[PDB]
Amino acid sequence: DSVECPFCDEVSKYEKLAKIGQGTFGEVFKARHRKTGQKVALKKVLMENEKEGFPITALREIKILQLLKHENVVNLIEICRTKASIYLVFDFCEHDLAGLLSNVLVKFTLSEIKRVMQMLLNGLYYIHRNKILHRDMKAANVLITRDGVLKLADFGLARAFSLPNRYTNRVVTLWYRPPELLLGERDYGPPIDLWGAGCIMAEMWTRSPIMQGNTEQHQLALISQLCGSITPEVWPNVDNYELYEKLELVKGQKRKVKDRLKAYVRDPYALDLIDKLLVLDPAQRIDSDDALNHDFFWSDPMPSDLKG
Amino acid sequence: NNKRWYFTREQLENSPSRRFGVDPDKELSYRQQAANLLQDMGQRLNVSQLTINTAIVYMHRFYMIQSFTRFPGNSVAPAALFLAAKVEGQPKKLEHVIKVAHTCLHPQESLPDTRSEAYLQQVQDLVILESIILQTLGFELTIDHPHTHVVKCTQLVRASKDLAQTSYFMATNSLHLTTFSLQYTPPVVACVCIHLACKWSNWEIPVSTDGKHWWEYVDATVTLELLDELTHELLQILEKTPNRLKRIWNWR
Numbered sequence: 001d002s003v004e005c006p007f008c009d010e011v012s013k014y015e016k017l018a019k020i021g022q023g024t025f026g027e028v029f030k031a032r033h034r035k036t037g038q039k040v041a042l043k044k045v046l047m048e049n050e051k052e053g054f055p056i057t058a059l060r061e062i063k064i065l066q067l068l069k070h071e072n073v074v075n076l077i078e079i080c081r082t083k084a085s086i087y088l089v090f091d092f093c094e095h096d097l098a099g100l101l102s103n104v105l106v107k108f109t110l111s112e113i114k115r116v117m118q119m120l121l122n123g124l125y126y127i128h129r130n131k132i133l134h135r136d137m138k139a140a141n142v143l144i145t146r147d148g149v150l151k152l153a154d155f156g157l158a159r160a161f162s163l164p165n166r167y168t169n170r171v172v173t174l175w176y177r178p179p180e181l182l183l184g185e186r187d188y189g190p191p192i193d194l195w196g197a198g199c200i201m202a203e204m205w206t207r208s209p210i211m212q213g214n215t216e217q218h219q220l221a222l223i224s225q226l227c228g229s230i231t232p233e234v235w236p237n238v239d240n241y242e243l244y245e246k247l248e249l250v251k252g253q254k255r256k257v258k259d260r261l262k263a264y265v266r267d268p269y270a271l272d273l274i275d276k277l278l279v280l281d282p283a284q285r286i287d288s289d290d291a292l293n294h295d296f297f298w299s300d301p302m303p304s305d306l307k308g
Numbered sequence: 309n310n311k312r313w314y315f316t317r318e319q320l321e322n323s324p325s326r327r328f329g330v331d332p333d334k335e336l337s338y339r340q341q342a343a344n345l346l347q348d349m350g351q352r353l354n355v356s357q358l359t360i361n362t363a364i365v366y367m368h369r370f371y372m373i374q375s376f377t378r379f380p381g382n383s384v385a386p387a388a389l390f391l392a393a394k395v396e397g398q399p400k401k402l403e404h405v406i407k408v409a410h411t412c413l414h415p416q417e418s419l420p421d422t423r424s425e426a427y428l429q430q431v432q433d434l435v436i437l438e439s440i441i442l443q444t445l446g447f448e449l450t451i452d453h454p455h456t457h458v459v460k461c462t463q464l465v466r467a468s469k470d471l472a473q474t475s476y477f478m479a480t481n482s483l484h485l486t487t488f489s490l491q492y493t494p495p496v497v498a499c500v501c502i503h504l505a506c507k508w509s510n511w512e513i514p515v516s517t518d519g520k521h522w523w524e525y526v527d528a529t530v531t532l533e534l535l536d537e538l539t540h541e542l543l544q545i546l547e548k549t550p551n552r553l554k555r556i557w558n559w560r
């Protein structure tokens with residue numbers, strides 16, 4: 001009832017322009033600051049069936065976005081109120097990765113592809129060193145500003161991790177989900193986002209996701225048809241999994257990682273990094289630090305700034 | 309700014325409660341009452357000491373913007389504890405917080421019917437009050453507590469289990485009895501908590517080989533002129549609190 005609120009300006013300070021979010025991904029607006037014209041993005045904190053006051057997940061997202069301040073992570077300007085409802089104020093990045101990939105008018109050179117994956121791996125390295133899992137790595141969550149700066153976005157399903165954990169297994173989209181989550185691992189960590197990073201790297205040349213599963217069994221079958229069957233010789237101690245005896249999957253598959261992706265990817269170093277990103281074993285999957293030191297980012301052509 | 313939620317002695321004097329008639333001593337009594345209600349409810353709701361301390365720091369900052377006259381301590385604390393519980397990984401159910409907050413404030417009254425008109429209002433009132441707390445704090449919910457810096461400092465002075473527990477005791481009660489959390493950083497308050505705990509237990513950490521005191525290794529801005537000044541303020545109000553010093557007094 002007309003309360004004193006210095007540190008929470010009203011969302012009317014921005015002027016809405018157009019909707020950029022429909023349906024599942026809430027209602028997002030492109031907005032313009034009424035004085036400086038700074039282009040921003042507003043997301044109303046949805047209060048659907050919240051019988052517990054302010055959403056605990058909105059608290060978790062806000063807390064995460066306040067800790068993560070990086071050139072390759074979206075920036076939370078502030079949180080605004082209304083004339084109670086709550087909005088999230090982000091800096092506006094015009095382009096997304098999925099929108100550029102599914103547009104035939106857009107073309108990436110090998111040098112620009114090196115820059116995109118370097119900014120994504122640098123962003124994943126920063127959030128992993130800050131004890132933050134993204135748990136929603138996909139092309140639609142990767143945005144690029146009009147300056148060519150890649151930003152990691154959509155930290156809603158993101159959670160913190162520490163070092164027997166009991167985490168949430170129903171995370172990450174089916175097409176980008178690592179084999180650990182499909183097998184029902186509740187003690188997972190950073191490499192679950194690095195698996196989705198490999199599915200994005202290959203998507204740069206294929207312009208379409210590589211493992212478009214329909215069910216959880218169809219996704220685990222699609223993984224084995226490309227990265228080889230789930231073998232205890234390939235995945236040491238994959239035995240303890242509950243669904244390992246109940247998988248019902250292919251058993252004689254051999255890694256089609258470099259063979260099936262050979263047509264779209266021309267570079268030898270790029271295929272070698274994708275192979276190490278899409279590794280079945282999490283303990284043997286390449287991490288954010290080693291992948292940035294991989295010879296893919298250190299051979300000709302070198303990474304170049306983004307323009308097309 | 310890093311100077312947003314930190315105030316001067318003149319700033320605290322001109323608090324919003326001062327502008328509605330609350331005396332300087334009357335306001336400290338209001339803060340001490342709320343922390344006891346936050347600790348009482350937190351001990352009943354079975355939340356960690358970290359959760360309670362976060363709700364207390366919310367309350368201390370909440371009344372730097374709002375006044376105790378417009379927002380009573382008996383109303384803000386159950387909403388501040390409900391918020392801090394959800395943030396600190398120990399979420400308590402909304403109908404449970406009001407259940408405990410009732411018998412804490414009204415031990416003789418009976419809780420109204422869950423489908424009554426009055427009960428549905430206070431359920432709305434707590435959610436309304438939680439929303440106002442979030443708006444008052446600017447959604448700045450991450451709190452650094454001196455307990456993180458106390459353990460890191462008693463380990464490097466080789467203090468026993470007893471002295472480390474006393475330093476932990478000085479930290480929990482500095483949030484209950486003083487506005488140190490509104491003026492001095494957690495590393496500075498932790499130095500004040502260990503200094504008074506050493507003065508209490510006749511423990512004296514000698515100077516290191518570099519001629520450097522132990523508090524220089526924790527925060528460079530800490531001086532002995534400041535430590536004795538703050539341990540004196542903390543000790544006075546500790547001497548005013550009943551049965552508080554008995555918990556750390558040596559009967560042997």
Ligand SMILES: CN(C)C(=O)c1cc2cnc(N[C@H]3CC[C@H](N)CC3)nc2n1C1CCCC1
Pocket residue numbers: 020021025028041042043074090091092093094095096099140141143153154155156
């Ligand atoms: C949780 N939210 C809201 C965010 O993390 C976030 C911060 C953003 C900052 N700029 C933009 N701009 C464009 C929206 C249209 C899209 N095609 C290209 C990006 N989207 C942001 N998003 C979401 C909303 C849309 C999906 C990405």
